[PDB]
Design a protein around this nucleic acid. Structure first.
Lengths: 120, 100, 178, 232, 51
RNA sequence: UAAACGAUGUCGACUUGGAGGUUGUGCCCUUGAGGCGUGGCUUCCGGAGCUAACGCGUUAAGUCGACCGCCUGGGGAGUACGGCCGCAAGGUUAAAACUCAAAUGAAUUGACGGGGGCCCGCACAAGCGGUGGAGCAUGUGGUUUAAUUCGAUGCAACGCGAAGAACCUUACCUGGUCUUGACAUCCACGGAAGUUUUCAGAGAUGAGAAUGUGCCUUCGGGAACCGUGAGACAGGUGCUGCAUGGCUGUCGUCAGCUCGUGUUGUGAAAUGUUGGGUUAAGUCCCGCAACGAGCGCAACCCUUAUCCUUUGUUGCCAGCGGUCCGGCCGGGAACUCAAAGGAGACUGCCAGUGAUAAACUGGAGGAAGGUGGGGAUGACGUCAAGUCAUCAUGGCCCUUACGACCAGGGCUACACACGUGCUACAAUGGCGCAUACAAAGAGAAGCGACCUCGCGAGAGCAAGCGGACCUCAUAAAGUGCGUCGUAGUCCGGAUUGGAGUCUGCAACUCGACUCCAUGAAGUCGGAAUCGCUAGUAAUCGUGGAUCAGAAUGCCACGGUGAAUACGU
């Protein structure tokens, strides 16, 4: 955005522009993440089985929504579900976020008040 | 390597000066066209045996750095292999890769 | 091999007439790079033609290059224990250049005292379709009519088009077995 | 075993030469052979110091040595006497009387040749060499630079075969024509014959230490440059 | 390019020599003095003979 | 009898199931060889367990259950032997001495497939030209004498290391000559070294004459340098490239190679490095337990092109003056022109295609649109590639020598074969007479104005040079007119005789240049045999590194300059 690598040949700038684009699309909504996350959110296991495997070895509590060919096995809470129908998977996702997030809104104000007793 | 090609290079310079200096134009003066009805006398051209080693015809030199035979270059005092070796480490002034 | 199709340099209408048919000709008339000699010969031929008929200087030149023309070439592409042959159609740029080459192959042994007379005279012959490359055009078509039986790796190739989710007819395109 | 030597191709652009003189063709060989003799016989005299490079220059009637060192004092010695004994014997060697300056000291812990001298020294003393090449790379990248390649030769452990090993890490470009990149091929001895270490170490892709001039002829030098336009 | 044999591959080197003239239409003696007092180069040879 | 089997001994009991192939039978819109209900064999899939691995998985090769058959390394031997059976080969249970350190179940990756298929390089194709056949030139083997020295031999060697072989040089061979040494350091003894010069000797080498007495000095004597003599040592083309170091070649611009790290396997190792889309490329979009990154490729880089620009001579002269209309000069910058600031071109714009995408093609100005043309430019590495001979160097030998000077001979010999390039076989040309414009560089062993001599070339003399000044240099093919027809000619000119010229003691075999006369091989070469995508291939001349005197080679430069790249 400064204009900094676009000099010399078009090749040296473009092979960076195109890679910046591949990274930007892949990482844009996870970019600030400072460390291994506190829980794991599965809406479908069909290609992402590995994310569940690794999370369990790192000792993270697992929250799953598993499809019909997936197994219910080896996680901390499961919802048995199915992977088809774009109207179903949308409703499963709207529901999960509310319970964690407005519990969280209340938590943040509480935490300042908890922390302040120490410094008093 | 051989000591004989180094021994040669040292021997020629006192003998260039000793035989050759008096003899410089003497091939032209006593023998060639400048001897038109003048000189042409054997007894003053039997004297070119002495400059025989000190001759322009034996300034083939070969390397000064190593004394190494065959493939010589006067402009380095070197040969093919030995030029390239000094050039790799940047020892020769002005020498660069050629592109055009 | 070869990722995509590549084109070719282009020769440019001659400075004395403005003709592409001359400009392609002067090039197959070239001996030891010497195209400015092959120019004097081409244009001195055209004035000799104009003396047989003054109605066009390019008249017998242009029609010779229609009449002695090859359309076809023969290719080889193995079938098992035997190689056989398959005719293939030649591209216009090489159809023209084969036909001009053959007029000039004959003209340089014709023994007339100048290549300008020799060449003009071998255009008189091939213009009426009576000359030296009439047999050479016929022989090349005889091979294409005789060898219409065989195809390029014929036993496996007939399965391969229908099996590569290609069509039920011989695919002229990269990564089908041809 | 492919490739032209890496520093051999850079000497016309943005790297200066190992020697800088002019001798007008006919005397060019007698001057290179003297420049070679002063290089060969001088590095033996400063054996007791540490040195990374030598750059020899022949102005008129004078030979000027520039020398590159691990630290400013080492060649200088006690009351300037040590460097005055260098300049005395370069004058004896050379076909002219001699001058000497010490350069600025730069990256002595990272230099190609002071690392390759260190790795050969292990081989000279017949150590098992189990970790040596890796610990070379580790310490060289711990002290600086952006990539290192090490290649070790000499019939390792004393074998009756050739037996190599090598290790590259980070970035080491190979065909580069711009910036310095520091390479040294050491040759050194042990009990069974010659052993040797090759050290490519890499500081940067851009060095400005030689570049083409800023300006066209007209704005550089004299304000009044203009000619009469005839009047012979 | 190799030490021995391997005939095909070779190496090619160039050396240029650049000549500049200036062309002082009249040089003052104070220019010739300054050239000669301030001399120390190896990278350029200056030729002070004429032609 | 065997390959008598889910590549399960038998049967039996127990163990989440779903579905197929397909079948009794209740029920369905009797709405997939369909579903449910309730049985079926038979089988795929996968969870527990089990395996070395494939594999099994509810019909086990799981969990076990009972009982029988049978094994105890390979080879030799599934035979021998004994009992029994079979016209009869055979069948049945089933072996040792002896030899041997392995044989055998499974998996990874390479190379490979003639199993299937994709992809790349001028690798073929699509052609074109050269070589193999001729001559010369030059190299290799065969072969030869005193000796014709070697290094190197599928594409990596045969015009290569070994760029200029009468001696020398130059590996060799012969004849001459001495041993610290024809080159350094050091000592003992004589001479200064250096120069000029007679004579013996081939010359090396020695004696003698004549010039000189420098350098340092208890003023003995010595260094430098030589003669003479020892050692330490110099010297060694002295051997080993499974003993090496340094360095580079091959494939190949192959289009790939690897590091950190996770997971899957018991691990060797995979995966990523492979797919879809796109490129010159592992280039780049999408993306699977592979993630992140680096090397090569990419880049900086020179060089050139037009084109803007400044310099203005050893560069230039649209115009104007003196004037034969010559930059010679009053004078000019318009002008190439030289080297340098650089400018232009970025799949960037715009259009179409392409999965959003890289990218290919079109459109427009311009010398030019496909990162402008050209080059630099080759990952890591088997190849036991190749150098001990640039040079380092251990192991390891002579050092009155495995050293070195001087002369003569030699590679280039000659019997041929084989490799390569030149020049030719034609007429695109040769011949005669007339006629034209270069580029780039080289020139203190060197070239050289002027000069006079010469038949062109050249020559000796010499001011001189630093090369935008002067010279090599007369650039050639090409241009003009007439002439010639496959006959070795009107092409090609080797051979050889003779004269004029050159560098050198010396030009016979092994040197150069000019020129007169005659004059052979060769009519585009079977086997064989290569580079090439466009300033390329082809073809012509020129210059140069080396270089006493040798260029067909090599190296760079400029003239004229092609077929096609469909297809794998």
């Amino acid at each position: 955005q400064d204009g900094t690598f676009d000099k010399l040949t078009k090749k040296e700038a473009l092979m960076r522009t195109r890679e910046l684009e591949k990274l930007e699309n892949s990482l844009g909504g996870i970019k600030d993440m400072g460390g291994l996350p506190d829980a794991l959110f599965v809406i479908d296991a069909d290609h992402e089985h590995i994310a569940i495997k690794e999370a369990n070895n790192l000792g993270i509590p697992v929250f799953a929504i598993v499809d019909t060919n997936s197994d219910p096995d080896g996680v901390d809470f499961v919802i048995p579900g199915n992977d088809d129908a774009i109207r179903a998977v949308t409703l499963y996702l709207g529901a999960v976020a509310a319970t964690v997030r407005e519990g969280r809104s209340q938590d943040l104000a509480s935490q300042a008040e908890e922390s302040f007793v120490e410094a008093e | 390597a051989k000591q004989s090609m180094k021994a040669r290079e040292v021997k020629r310079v006192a003998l260039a000066d000793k035989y050759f200096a008096k003899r410089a134009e003497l091939k032209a003066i006593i023998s060639d066209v400048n001897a038109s009805d003048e000189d042409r006398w054997n007894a003053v051209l039997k004297l070119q045996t002495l400059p025989r080693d000190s001759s322009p015809s034996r300034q083939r030199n070969r390397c000064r750095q190593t004394g190494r035979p065959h493939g010589f270059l006067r402009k380095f005092g070197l040969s093919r292999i030995k030029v390239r070796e000094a050039a790799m480490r940047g020892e020769i002034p002005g020498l660069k890769k050629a592109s055009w | 091999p070869r990722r995509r199709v590549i084109g070719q340099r282009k020769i440019l209408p001659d400075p004395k007439f403005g003709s592409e048919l001359l400009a392609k000709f002067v090039n197959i008339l070239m001996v030891d790079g010497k195209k400015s000699t092959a120019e004097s010969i081409v244009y001195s031929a055209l004035e000799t033609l104009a003396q047989r008929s003054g109605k066009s200087e390019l008249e017998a030149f242009e029609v010779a290059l229609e009449n002695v023309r090859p359309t076809v070439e023969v290719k080889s592409r193995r079938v098992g224990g035997s190689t056989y042959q398959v005719p293939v159609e030649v591209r216009p740029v090489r159809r023209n250049a084969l036909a001009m080459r053959w007029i000039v192959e004959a003209a340089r042994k014709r023994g007339d005292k100048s290549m300008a007379l020799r060449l003009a005279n071998e255009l008189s012959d091939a213009a009426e379709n009576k000359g030296t490359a009439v047999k050479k055009r016929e022989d090349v078509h005889r091979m294409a009519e005789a060898n219409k039986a065989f195809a390029h790796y014929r036993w496996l190739s007939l399965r391969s088009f229908s099996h590569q989710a290609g069509a039920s007819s011989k695919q002229p395109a990269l990564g089908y077995l041809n | 075993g492919q490739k032209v030597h890496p520093n051999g191709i850079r000497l016309g652009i943005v790297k200066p030469w190992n020697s800088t003189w002019f001798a007008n063709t006919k005397e060019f060989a007698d001057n290179l052979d003297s420049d070679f003799k002063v290089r060969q016989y001088l590095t033996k005299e400063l054996a007791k110091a540490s040195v990374s490079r030598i750059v020899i220059e022949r102005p008129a009637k004078s030979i000027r040595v520039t020398i590159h060192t691990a630290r400013p004092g080492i060649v200088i010695g006690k009351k300037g006497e040590d460097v005055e004994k260098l300049r005395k014997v370069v004058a004896d060697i050379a076909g002219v009387p001699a001058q000497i300056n010490i350069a600025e000291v730069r990256k002595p812990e990272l230099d190609a040749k002071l690392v390759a001298d260190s790795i050969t020294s292990q081989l000279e003393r017949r150590v098992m060499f189990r970790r040596a090449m890796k610990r070379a790379v580790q310490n060289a990248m711990r002290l600086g630079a952006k990539g290192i390649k090490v290649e070790v030769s000499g019939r390792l452990g004393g074998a009756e075969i050739a037996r190599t090993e090598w290790y590259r890490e980070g970035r080491v470009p190979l065909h580069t024509l711009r910036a310095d990149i520091d390479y040294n091929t050491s040759e050194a001895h042990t009990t069974y014959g010659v052993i040797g270490v090759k050290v490519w170490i890499f500081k940067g892709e851009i060095l400005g230490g030689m570049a083409a001039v800023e300006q066209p002829e007209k704005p550089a030098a004299q304000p009044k440059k203009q000619q009469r336009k005839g009047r012979k | 390019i190799s030490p021995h044999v391997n005939k095909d591959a070779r190496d090619q080197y160039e050396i240029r020599t650049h000549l500049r003239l200036v062309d002082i239409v009249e040089p003052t003696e104070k220019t010739v003095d300054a050239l000669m007092r301030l001399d120390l180069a190896a990278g350029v040879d200056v030729q002070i003979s004429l032609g």
